[PDB]
């Protein structure tokens, strides 16, 4: 399945992220819902074109394979996904 980083992207739902795209566009806004395939949907999006302008989308849906990176907020530095030793409470049967 997923692996740690896209699990983090599944964690940072509804919080102010910033995306660069491969075009150089860095969308920024609240993260409505990410998928496992890194297609991410965003709201109140403020966009920076490659030309240097800035605009405001309301409701964007950027495809995963043109994301350059994504920045989540800082606090997720401390996240239970990163805990190397948290033991599993008897998986279901």
């Amino acid at each position: 399945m997923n692996g740690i980083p896209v699990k983090l992207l599944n964690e940072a739902q509804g919080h102010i992220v910033s995306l660069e795209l491969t075009t150089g566009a860095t969308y920024r806004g609240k993260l409505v819902e990410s998928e496992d395939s890194m297609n991410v949907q965003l709201r109140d999006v403020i966009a920076t074109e490659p030309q240097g302008a800035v605009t405001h989308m309301d409701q964007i849906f950027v495809r995963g394979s043109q994301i350059k990176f994504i920045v989540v907020p800082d606090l997720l530095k401390n996240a239970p996904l990163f805990k190397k030793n948290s033991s599993r409470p008897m998986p279901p049967i």
Binding site: G3, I4, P5, L8, K68, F69, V71
Partner: protein, 121 residues
């Protein structure tokens, strides 16, 4: 940088090191890797991203280089648009300290499972 990186270590051994991962654009990300995956999606804590400008690139040609850094902090970079990663700083806490820390984490985890077994009773 005289850092003397571990001659038999790969990604999982490189954890919590300060990396200098480099991309297809030629942008550099600098920060603590805290996780990777199969596709080499990295997280990068406290990350700073540096470019060279097109103009400073002329000075880079065959020296002091005005690299442009923006600060991306906790970012989570992708395995598609990267090139290669190297290691820039060793982590904060040494091998004995990391080892004792992992011991304490495991003891606390076993204890939390004992508490789950107690609440289950």
């Amino acid at each position: 940088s005289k850092i003397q990186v571990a001659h038999s270590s790969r990604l999982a051994n490189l954890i919590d090191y300060k990396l200098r991962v480099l991309t297809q654009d030629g942008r550099v990300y600098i920060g603590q890797l805290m996780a990777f995956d199969k596709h080499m999606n990295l997280v990068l804590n406290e990350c700073i991203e540096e470019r060279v400008p097109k103009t400073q690139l002329d000075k880079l040609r065959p020296l002091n280089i005005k690299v442009e850094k923006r600060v991306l902090g906790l970012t989570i970079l992708r395995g598609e648009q990267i090139l290669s990663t190297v290691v820039e700083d060793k982590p904060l806490l040494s091998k004995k300290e990391r080892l004792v820390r992992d011991k304490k984490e495991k003891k606390q985890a076993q204890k939390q499972t004992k508490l789950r077994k107690e609440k289950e009773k």
